[PDB]
Amino acid sequence: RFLKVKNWETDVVLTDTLHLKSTLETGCTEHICMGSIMLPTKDQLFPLAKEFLDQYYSSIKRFGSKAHMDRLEEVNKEIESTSTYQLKDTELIYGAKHAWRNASRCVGRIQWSKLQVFDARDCTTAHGMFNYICNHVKYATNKGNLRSAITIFPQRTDGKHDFRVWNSQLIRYAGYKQPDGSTLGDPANVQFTEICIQQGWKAPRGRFDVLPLLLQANGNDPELFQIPPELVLEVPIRHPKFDWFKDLGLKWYGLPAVSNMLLEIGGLEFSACPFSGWYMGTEIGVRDYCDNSRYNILEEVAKKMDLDMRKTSSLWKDQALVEINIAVLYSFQSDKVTIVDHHSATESFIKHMENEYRCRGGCPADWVWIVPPMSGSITPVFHQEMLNYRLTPSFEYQPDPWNTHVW
Amino acid sequence: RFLKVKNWETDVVLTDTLHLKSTLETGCTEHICMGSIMLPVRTKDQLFPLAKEFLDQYYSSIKRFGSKAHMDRLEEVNKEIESTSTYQLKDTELIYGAKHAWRNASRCVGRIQWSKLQVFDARDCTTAHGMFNYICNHVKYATNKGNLRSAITIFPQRTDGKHDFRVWNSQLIRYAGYKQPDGSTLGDPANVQFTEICIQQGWKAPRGRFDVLPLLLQANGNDPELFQIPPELVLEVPIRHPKFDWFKDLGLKWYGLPAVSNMLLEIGGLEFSACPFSGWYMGTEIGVRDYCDNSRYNILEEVAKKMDLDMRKTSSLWKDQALVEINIAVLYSFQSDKVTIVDHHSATESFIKHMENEYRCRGGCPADWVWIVPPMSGSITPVFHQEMLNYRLTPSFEYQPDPWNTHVWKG
Numbered sequence: 172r173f174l175k176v177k178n179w180e181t182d183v184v185l186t187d188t189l190h191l192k193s194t195l196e197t198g199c200t201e202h203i204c205m206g207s208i209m210l211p212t213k214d215q216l217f218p219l220a221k222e223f224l225d226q227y228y229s230s231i232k233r234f235g236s237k238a239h240m241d242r243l244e245e246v247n248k249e250i251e252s253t254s255t256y257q258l259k260d261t262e263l264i265y266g267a268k269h270a271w272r273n274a275s276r277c278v279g280r281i282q283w284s285k286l287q288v289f290d291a292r293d294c295t296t297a298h299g300m301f302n303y304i305c306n307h308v309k310y311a312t313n314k315g316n317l318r319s320a321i322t323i324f325p326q327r328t329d330g331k332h333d334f335r336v337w338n339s340q341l342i343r344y345a346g347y348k349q350p351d352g353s354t355l356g357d358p359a360n361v362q363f364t365e366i367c368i369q370q371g372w373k374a375p376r377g378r379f380d381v382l383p384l385l386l387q388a389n390g391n392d393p394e395l396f397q398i399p400p401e402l403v404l405e406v407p408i409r410h411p412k413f414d415w416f417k418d419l420g421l422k423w424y425g426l427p428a429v430s431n432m433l434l435e436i437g438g439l440e441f442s443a444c445p446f447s448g449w450y451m452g453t454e455i456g457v458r459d460y461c462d463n464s465r466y467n468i469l470e471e472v473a474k475k476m477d478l479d480m481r482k483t484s485s486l487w488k489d490q491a492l493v494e495i496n497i498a499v500l501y502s503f504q505s506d507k508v509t510i511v512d513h514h515s516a517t518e519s520f521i522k523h524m525e526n527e528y529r530c531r532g533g534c535p536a537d538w539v540w541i542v543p544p545m546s547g548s549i550t551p552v553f554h555q556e557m558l559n560y561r562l563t564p565s566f567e568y569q570p571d572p573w574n575t576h577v578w
Numbered sequence: 579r580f581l582k583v584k585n586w587e588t589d590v591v592l593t594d595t596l597h598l599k600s601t602l603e604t605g606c607t608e609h610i611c612m613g614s615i616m617l618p619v620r621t622k623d624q625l626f627p628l629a630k631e632f633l634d635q636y637y638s639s640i641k642r643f644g645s646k647a648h649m650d651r652l653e654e655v656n657k658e659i660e661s662t663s664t665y666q667l668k669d670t671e672l673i674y675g676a677k678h679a680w681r682n683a684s685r686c687v688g689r690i691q692w693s694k695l696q697v698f699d700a701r702d703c704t705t706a707h708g709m710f711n712y713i714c715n716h717v718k719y720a721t722n723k724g725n726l727r728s729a730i731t732i733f734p735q736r737t738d739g740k741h742d743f744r745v746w747n748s749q750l751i752r753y754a755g756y757k758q759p760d761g762s763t764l765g766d767p768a769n770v771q772f773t774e775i776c777i778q779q780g781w782k783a784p785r786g787r788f789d790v791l792p793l794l795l796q797a798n799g800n801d802p803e804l805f806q807i808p809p810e811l812v813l814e815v816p817i818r819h820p821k822f823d824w825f826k827d828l829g830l831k832w833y834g835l836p837a838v839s840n841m842l843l844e845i846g847g848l849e850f851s852a853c854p855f856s857g858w859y860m861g862t863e864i865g866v867r868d869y870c871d872n873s874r875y876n877i878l879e880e881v882a883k884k885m886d887l888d889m890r891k892t893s894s895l896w897k898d899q900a901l902v903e904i905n906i907a908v909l910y911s912f913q914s915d916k917v918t919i920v921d922h923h924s925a926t927e928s929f930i931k932h933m934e935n936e937y938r939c940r941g942g943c944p945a946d947w948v949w950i951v952p953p954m955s956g957s958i959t960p961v962f963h964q965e966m967l968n969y970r971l972t973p974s975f976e977y978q979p980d981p982w983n984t985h986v987w988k989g
């Protein structure tokens with residue numbers, strides 16, 4: 172099966188062969204495409220381990236070698252005996268990097284081979300998880316010169332002793348339902364904030380309160396910890412032309428760090444594996460600030476701009492959107508905190524995708540997520556056909572643990 | 579079976595049952611999604627089930643399923659197919675079929691309008707000259723001096739595939755493109771190939787930036803013939819900006835009538851290879867796609883230069899700034915000239931209302947997110963956070979290859 176993808180701006184056609192290695196299911200069928208849906212034993216374990224070890228040994232040009240066969244032998248014996256196995260440090264690093272490489276929704280993958288991997292498999296307690304996470308935050312932040320990193324806690328055993336970070340991101344702001352009926356802070360985080368308060372957090376009750384970590388070790392009830400304030404780098408948002416923009420009192424945090432996903436390597440499952448990169452500007456300026464269910468700031472900004480807001484066709488929303496995104500980029504750049512604009516990021520991804528087709532035979536990509544949430548068609552990803560499929564090692568969505576945990 | 583879709587802004591959940599009536603394939607499998615791939619003579623045997631499926635649908639819509647009239651029509655069509663290898667649609671069935679092809683068009687954000695479609699029956703047409711007259715009449719009716727009305731003109735169906743009616747133009751009104759010896763393009767680069775064909779067939783090209791192409795029309799499988807649409811029937815809008823007085827001197831204009839002429843209409847297994855249809859523009863189609871695609875008029879740089887934007891780094895978002903102003907100009911210009919146009923906020927809000935109504939009254943609304951989301955400011959429109967299900971219902975509009983690749987030249 173050779174599949175062709177065309178770029179409609181450049182007429183360039185690429186051939187994908189890598190999809191033939193796809194394992195997991197898409198949710199689509201021959202009858203119905205679900206491309207726009209957000210969430211569409213010993214016996215099982217050895218084939219998964221073999222598939223992975225085969226790809227690993229092939230990557231280091233040692234496929235079919237004595238070391239290859241011996242390692243397969245070693246792992247087989249370990250699974251038969253213990254019902255599981257442990258990855259070598261080399262295998263863990265390779266697996267984490269490839270999980271990023273394989274992430275079809277990530278526009279930033281040109282960077283995939285430069286990931287710092289922190290092995291936290293020796294961690295046993297929630298206090299130990301906190302120390303590791305602070306160290307990740309400080310390393311990744313690096314005084315504004317951000318470095319990609321992942322911290323990997325112990326793998327799932329019987330499923331009754333899971334390590335989990337309850338937070339969706341390591342750094343994120345609290346949300347509070349008001350007597351007024353509105354929401355103060357980030358509406359995305361109202362439920363998690365409540366759980367935090369319920370578990371004893373003393374909430375400051377402001378618009379940008381950094382949430383504490385709720386950390387679960389070894390299947391135990393989660394415990395609360397506050398990240399040292401001085402490790403959380405934040406940027407106040409101002410505009411290069413509009414003096415009034417600072418008066419909106421907006422800020423954001425510098426470090427985007429996903430903490431709710433599951434890392435699968437060689438059939439093993441790492442349910443706590445926080446990872447971090449740096450922001451694309453639209454993530455803050457379009458998603459976090461302008462989604463109606465988020466900080467929802469479009470109307471306030473347009474008002475300060477004195478735009479004609481009576482008619483949609485004046486494009487007042489589009490004008491204010493652009494200015495908000497200009498201010499996000501300017502503020503991060505002025506404070507020397509790494510950020511990438513959507514033009515630069517998508518150009519890089521296209522270059523990455525071409526590299527991947529030539530050296531790997533393809534690059535799985537989800538167009539719905541790869542195309543930026545503003546100015547889509549003026550970026551080089553819009554007219555690029557993409558094929559979406561699932562390769563392992565992988566990062567997988569997992570449900571919020573409070574729906575699952577038994578106290 | 580039931581499939582659920584969620585809206586991630588409102589948490590509204592809807593349930594699709596209509597997908598059960600989908601027949602044709604998507605291109606996707608359990609292992610690979612082809613959601614962003616742009617392109618992912620029947621026998622008696624296959625034709626009668628297709629005819630019956632259609633007629634059952636039609637008679638249900640008029641609340642006459644199982645009636646004598648329904649049963650009599652099935653028998654009549656069966657006997658026509660067995661005897662002549664095909665059948666003719668009644669005028670009522672043709673109208674219903676064309677409206678439903680539009681209703682079913684998963685890439686169309688304008689479908690709130692689907693039941694308001696003027697159908698011109700051109701199945702008595704026999705010559706290219708005849709096609710030309712029908713097409714002029716469509717253009718005049720649809721244009722309505724700027725108060726645009728949706729319309730479709732339907733030419734005779736496929737017989738043996740050797741006698742097809744085709745409009746060779748991709749759109750009824752579109753501008754010429756000319757490749758220069760230095761490798762630059764004058765006019766619309768999308769139409770260079772078709773323009774060369776027109777010139778070869780005898781068109782005297784003005785060689786300007788906005789030359790309306792001639793129609794190239796094929797009747798009954800014959801070689802196509804050239805006709806010029808009368809200039810007085812082609813409504814155009816000069817583009818200016820409400821605040822920037824220099825915008826007019828960019829010399830931009832566009833035509834008012836968007837009219838697709840290269841698609842195939844399938845109704846009850848019958849294939850209408852020439853079926854031009856038209857509505858009115860969403861502003862971004864002109865201001866984003868036609869003006870700003872790098873492979874089209876590609877005006878972003880010139881506009882940004884005139885705005886004196888900082889163009890040294892992409893992070894100043896100069897491209898984004900220029901794009902908004904161009905799109906303001908397009909909407910302003912059409913509105914000022916009283917030519918129907920819809921902005922992307924209005925169009926997507928109306929589509930979501932249409933979609934929710936369809937889920938309630940019909941059990942679903944197939945939709946292609948990739949095409950439905952506008953090409954600028956996506957996430958601030960109500961379609962961006964709407965989950966959609968894409969599947970194929972008939973009657974339908976289908977892509978067909980450009981006829982110059984397939985035509986047997988007679989001489």
Ligand code: HEM
Nearest residue numbers: 271274276277278279282319446447448449450451540566
């Ligand atoms: C280095 C800079 C990085 C940039 C600029 C970047 C960019 C992005 C963006 C813009 C998104 C989608 C957000 C949206 O559409 O609103 C995303 C998603 C994602 N990225 Fe990256 N990324 C980076 C690093 C990383 C790293 C280090 C990893 C893992 C090691 C990673 C894995 C993922 C995954 C798994 C998703 C999908 C997340 C989900 O399903 O919620 N990315 N990336």
Ligand code: HEM
Nearest residue numbers: 680683685686687688691728855856857858859860949975
């Ligand atoms: C009445 C106003 C209408 C509006 C505002 C509208 C809007 C649009 C837009 C914006 C697109 C996609 C263009 C793009 O993504 O650049 C589209 C596609 C399409 N529409 Fe409509 N539409 C209208 C009427 C019609 C009518 C009358 C029909 C047929 C009877 C129709 C059938 C289609 C089809 C088949 C496509 C996909 C075209 C292709 O594959 O090339 N629409 N519509």
Ligand SMILES: Cc1cc(N)nc(CCc2cncc(CCc3cc(C)nc(N)c3)c2)c1
Nearest residue numbers: 209427428429446447448449450451454568
């Ligand atoms: C490492 C990294 C770097 C970066 N620049 N951006 C990201 C995106 C993080 C991100 C932020 N906000 C929202 C999401 C989506 C969360 C999300 C929600 C649901 C329901 N399903 C999913 N698969 C995912 C992801 C990650």
Ligand SMILES: Cc1cc(N)nc(CCc2cncc(CCc3cc(C)nc(N)c3)c2)c1
Nearest residue numbers: 458462539540541542543544586587962963
């Ligand atoms: C369709 C789409 C496109 C794109 N470029 N990025 C994304 C992912 C990021 C994203 C943006 N806006 C909104 C969301 C949903 C956030 C969200 C997450 C959860 C758990 N519950 C909710 N009700 C809502 C995610 C999605």
Ligand SMILES: Cc1cc(N)nc(CCc2cncc(CCc3cc(C)nc(N)c3)c2)c1
Nearest residue numbers: 616836837838855856857858859860863977
């Ligand atoms: C009736 C109608 C009204 C309206 N406002 N817009 C449209 C969209 C017309 C349109 C304009 N430019 C480009 C296209 C895409 C052409 C196209 C190209 C390819 C390769 N495959 C396809 N299925 C389609 C469509 C149609």
Ligand SMILES: Cc1cc(N)nc(CCc2cncc(CCc3cc(C)nc(N)c3)c2)c1
Nearest residue numbers: 179180553554867871948949950951952953
């Ligand atoms: C991905 C996508 C999104 C969207 N919203 N609309 C469309 C359809 C309209 C559209 C816009 N720009 C470009 C094209 C392709 C036009 C095109 C057509 C042909 C035949 N050859 C080419 N090289 C290019 C179509 C496509």
Ligand SMILES: [Cl-]
Nearest residue numbers: 457458544957
């Ligand atoms: Cl968004």
Ligand SMILES: [Cl-]
Nearest residue numbers: 548866867953
């Ligand atoms: Cl476009």
Ligand SMILES: [Zn+2]
Nearest residue numbers: 458462957963
């Ligand atoms: Zn959003």
Ligand SMILES: [Zn+2]
Nearest residue numbers: 199204606611
């Ligand atoms: Zn699909």
Ligand SMILES: [Zn+2]
Nearest residue numbers: 548554867871
């Ligand atoms: Zn385009």
